[PDB]
Every structure is written in C-alpha cells, then in structure tokens.
C-alpha cells in the first residue's frame with residue numbers, strides 16, 4: 214500500500230476519505246474545533262481562505278497598533294520567513310534562539326528569550342517542518358506580552374493552553390488536511406486596532422463579522438478526531454510514532470539526525486544517510502515500496518519524513534521496516 | 545430535480561460532479577488560456593480567496609507612483625471596490641448610472657470622464673445584485689490600463705483579453721468552486737507593487753514562485769471545451785436569458801426595471817407587481833425544487849442566477865413555475 218510522507222500538502226485520514234466517499238457540515242466545524250482544543254469563549258475563531266503565509270502579514274497588520282516594533286524568534290526557516298514579511302510593516306527585534314546542545318541543534322528555553330519592552334507582540338514558530346525543530350514549552354510570560362504563534366504543522370497534535378496566547382494561526386494544509394483554509398484563534402481584546410490600510414480579507418475585526426469545501430473536509434477531520442478520543446489520544450499516538458522513528462534512526466550508525474532531543478519535532482523528522490551517495494537508490498527503492506515523498510527540502514537535502522495525525526502507526530512501521538532492510542542491504 | 549439559483553456560492557455542472565464522483569493542475573491553466581484565447585504577454589495567476597481580495601490587490605499592485613485611479617460606479621460590487629480603494633488612493637468616481645426609457649441603464653464607455661493622472665480604470669461588467677451588465681468592449685487608447693471584476697461572467701462569452709490590463713474573477717460564481725480567484729495580468733504591469741503589499745496579494749511574487757478547488761476548475765474547463773467552448777456557452781446563455789426575460793416581459797405580474805442593453809444574462813432580478821405575495825412565491829418555489837431565489841436584502845424582491853452550470857431545463861422549470869404561479873395568484 215502507498216504512504217505519503219509529504220510535509221505539505223499532507224495526507225488525509227483513511228476514514229475522512231471513506232466517509233467522504235459514502236456521503237457522496239456548516240457551522241459545526243468551528244464548534245468542534247473549539248471543543249477539541251477547549252478554546253475559551255474570550256477567543257474568536259476565524260476560518261479564512263489561503264495558506265498560513267497570509268498571517269505573516271496578517272499578524273503585524275492587526276496587532277502592531279501604533280507601535281513600530283515586535284519581537285520575533287528565529288529558530289528556522291518559517292520563523293525567518295515570518296520575519297522577512299514583517300519588515301514590510303515594522304522593524305522586528307530578532308531573537309536568535311539557535312544554540313548547540315550536546316553537539317546538536319537546539320533552541321534556547323523561553324526564559325532566556327530577550328524581549329524588548331516596546332514590542333507590540335512576540336512571534337515564534339513552535340514547529341519548523343524543514344528543520345525538524347520544535348519548541349514545546351508552554352509560554353508563561355507576564356500579562357504584558359502578547360504571544361503570537363504559527364501552529365501550521367502541529368495544531369491538533371497535542372493539548373494546547375490557548376489562554377496563554379494572543380494569536381494562534383495555522384494553515385490547514387499540514388496537520389488538518391484540506392488545503393486552502395487557514396484558522397486564526399484571536400483573543401478578542403486585541404481586535405479593533407488593525408492598520409487603516411489592512412486589506413479587508415486580512416482584517417480580523419472585519420472578518421469577525423461576515424463556505425468552501427475545505428470547510429466540509431475539515432469538519433469531517435474534527436469529527437474523526439473527536440471519535441479517536443481527541444487531542445489527548447492523538448498526542449499519545451503521535452508520541453509512539455515519533456519514538457518508533459527516532460528510535461530506529463538513533464540505534465543505527467547508518468541513519469543520522471542532528472536535533473537535540475528536547476527540540477525534536479514529532480511531526481517532521483529529517484534525517485541523513487551516513488553514506489550520502491546512497492540518497493538516489495534510497496529514494497528509488499523507498500518510492501518503489503509504497504513510501505512516497507521522502508526527499509528532504511532542497512535547502513537542507515537528505516531525507517524528511519512527515520508523520521502527521523493522518524499518518525497511522527502502520528505507515529511509520531512500513532517506513533522503519535524499510536529503513537532497517539535497506540541498511541541491512543547497503544550497510 | 546433541484547435547481548439552485550443562488551448568485552454565490554453557485555451550482556456545479558452535473559457532469560463535473562459525476563466525473564468528480566469517480567474517484568491534473570498544470571493543465572488547468574493551459575485550458576483556461578485556451579478557452580479564452582489569452583495572449584502570451586499575459587500572466588495567469590491562480591490564488592486563494594474570493595474576488596474581494598482583488599479590491600485591495602489591484603491598487604496595491606497597479607498604483608505605482610500615482611495616487612489616484614478612475615473607478616466606475618454602476619452598482620453594489622463596483623461601489624465596494626471603490627470603498628476598499630480609499631484605503632490606498634483617492635478614487636475618481638465616474639457615476640455611470642443613468643435612466644433610459646424609464647429603466648436602469650449605464651452610460652456608454654465613450655462618455656466615461658477619465659483622468660490623465662489615473663493609474664488605471666476599474667469597472668464591473670456584471671453586477672449580481674443589480675442585474676446590470678456592461679457588455680461593451682473597451683477600446684480606450686493604449687495609455688489607459690483597464691481593470692475589471694469578471695467574477696460573475698467569466699467564461700460565459702468570448703472576451704478580447706488584449707484590451708485589458710487586469711481581469712480578475714472569484715471562481716465561486718460562474719466557474720463553481722469556492723476558494724479560488726483567477727487573475728489575468730498583462731506582464732508589463734508587474735514589478736511596481738507597493739513595498740507593503742502583502743506577498744499573498746503581490747502579483748510579481750506569486751508569478752515568481754495546489755487546492756482541491758484547483759482540480760474542480762480543471763474539470764469545469766474540460767467540460768466547457770467539450771461543449772464547444774465559450775462561443776457555445778454564450779449561445780446557450782443567450783437562449784436561457786431570452787426565455788427568462790421573455791416570460792418576465794410578457795407578464796404584467798412580474799417586473800424587471802433594467803434597460804435592455806444593460807440586462808445581465810447571468811443575474812436576473814425581478815419583482816412581483818403585488819409584492820405582498822413575496823413570502824408565498826418563496827415557499828412554493830422552494831417546495832417545487834427551485835432554490836435560493838430571494839433577492840438581496842437591500843433591493844428586496846426576487847433574483848435568479850443562471851450561470852454556465854444552470855441548464856436550460858432549470859430556467860424552463862423556473863418559468864413554468866412562474867407561469868403557473870400567475871395562473872393561481874393573478
């Protein structure tokens with residue numbers, strides 16, 4: 214059978230597809246999303262068209278207010294993209310959180326992040342798909358820090374204390390499934406200060422007032438999640454999926470992963486082959502074994518396996534069985 | 545069977561769904577280019593969102609070093625575009641609304657007072673709520689950059705794309721799939737987006753570097769080609785329009801106040817002579833399988849959208865219903 218380990222567009226749960234097949238709703242989707250994550254009533258939830266990239270502009274356009282600076286954490290590619298886009302609207306104060314721990318790539322803990330007092334908000338990316346770096350720490354800054362975070366590749370994989378954030382956004386294409394949809398969770402008191410020239414389609418206050426198909430699909434994905442035991446159940450399953458894959462990579466001298474354990478992503482697992490010359494055959498033999506889209510991003514090279522909610526444990530097992538046999542044959 | 549006359553979100557063609565029922569992306573653009581005969585000096589962008597985004601996207605990409613643009617107001621969507629443009633420039637408003645033979649009309653293009661300092665000219669060729677269409681082919685000088693919101697009529701007729709600077713259309717109306725917006729832009733207009741234009745709205749960035757609505761559109765474009773293309777579609781829409789307007793005009797019971805020359809072939813608003821019967825018309829038509837005919841809250845009355853996907857059998861069921869309703873309530 215075929216398993217697709219692509220980071221985006223990512224796979225759709227086996228059942229959602231089937232349900233989609235046999236049934237061929239509206240407002241329920243949002244309620245289900247609020248229920249799944251236990252979103253407090255003081256948070257507005259917006260469903261807008263477009264990918265997550267839009268919010269690289271959306272956040273500064275809605276939250277700078279009359280301020281001209283904002284704190285941005287750089288710990289990888291998407292965080293750096295957010296920063297490049299923010300320069301159009303403010304002078305971001307860049308917090309370089311990249312460090313080496315035990316010879317591997319890691320990220321400084323939040324208490325060491327140097328925030329500036331004039332910052333309009335703080336922005337960070339809890340999961341970098343290309344780098345395989347995750348920041349799982351729950352934010353706990355004072356009530357004067359407005360925390361904004363890009364949860365595109367990890368929303369719905371673990372419980373989340375939404376109350377600790379100002380804005381949480383996520384393109385639906387990675388961990389939810391349907392492409393073309395973006396979710397924005399926004400603390401209500403932050404509404405009302407969008408730049409006068411912010412396009413209406415990006416204005417949180419305007420959208421807060423006044424339905425695709427990706428909406429329907431997501432609706433089914435939320436029901437499926439609830440039926441699986443929700444975000445707590447998904448967290449358990451993802452924890453085992455990650456352990457199985459990282460376990461195989463670490464017990465082999467043939468496969469390598471250079472990210473500190475505390476910052477290892479549970480959704481995107483990049484790895485290299487010790488003998489780099491075998492990359493071609495690895496991609497050819499894996500592809501010819503039902504294991505799709507493993508080539509790492511051009512920027513980094515190597516291999517990358519995305520194991521989102523939709524990816525079952527059987528899919529990860531097939532990948533690991535293949536890696537072991539391949540090392541057995543080329544090692 | 546059920547026929548849905550909603551202006552947006554709109555109906556999908558029967559075959560596209562059956563084809564879709566079982567079970568790629570790059571052909572979609574080539575098929576769109578071919579349907580409309582888009583010249584090679586135009587870029588075609590497929591992006592997310594509805595057409596509303598372009599109310600901002602056009603001025604953000606085309607103002608350049610100018611601070612004004614000419615905007616034609618002959619309806620609701622044209623007025624909304626103007627309202628959004630005030631965020632980026634001082635629009636020079638051309639009031640094209642006139643009365644002809646006692647009915648709502650639009651001033652011919654040669655009477656549009658253009659400004660020399662304008663970065664472009666914007667107009668809406670088909671107003672869904674007002675049922676007003678401006679079918680005239682633009683033929684302004686080469687110093688006029690014409691931009692237009694074709695959301696509600698794209699693909700319903702042949703179009704001389706070479707006469708425009710930018711043509712944009714949300715797909716939710718005449719193509720079907722919500723979530724997709726198509727922008728056709730003459731390549732020489734690229735490269736002057738405002739430095740603060742968000743990247744998702746920047747034509748130059750989108751051009752430099754896929755959804756499901758993308759796949760559906762591909763099916764719709766293939767379906768259109770199999771029907772004989774835009775020329776065929778135009779012919780069928782003409783007949784659908786003639787039937788609906790014909791029945792409305794031949795009755796004293798139903799009224800439409802739009803001048804013949806500006807009658808939309810896609811959005812047909814109408815009132816009942818005795819408007820107290822509005823509730824009953826909606827309940828009985830809904831019960832007869834004729835859905836979403838309620839005219840927009842503002843204008844009131846009734847409105848039937850008859851896009852490419854709406855077959856003539858649907859228009860005929862609507863008219864047979866209108867005729868029987870007059871028999872029973874007239």
Ligand SMILES: [Ca+2]
Nearest residue numbers: 462463465468
């Ligand atoms: Ca290893």
Ligand SMILES: [Ca+2]
Nearest residue numbers: 792793795798
């Ligand atoms: Ca009449």
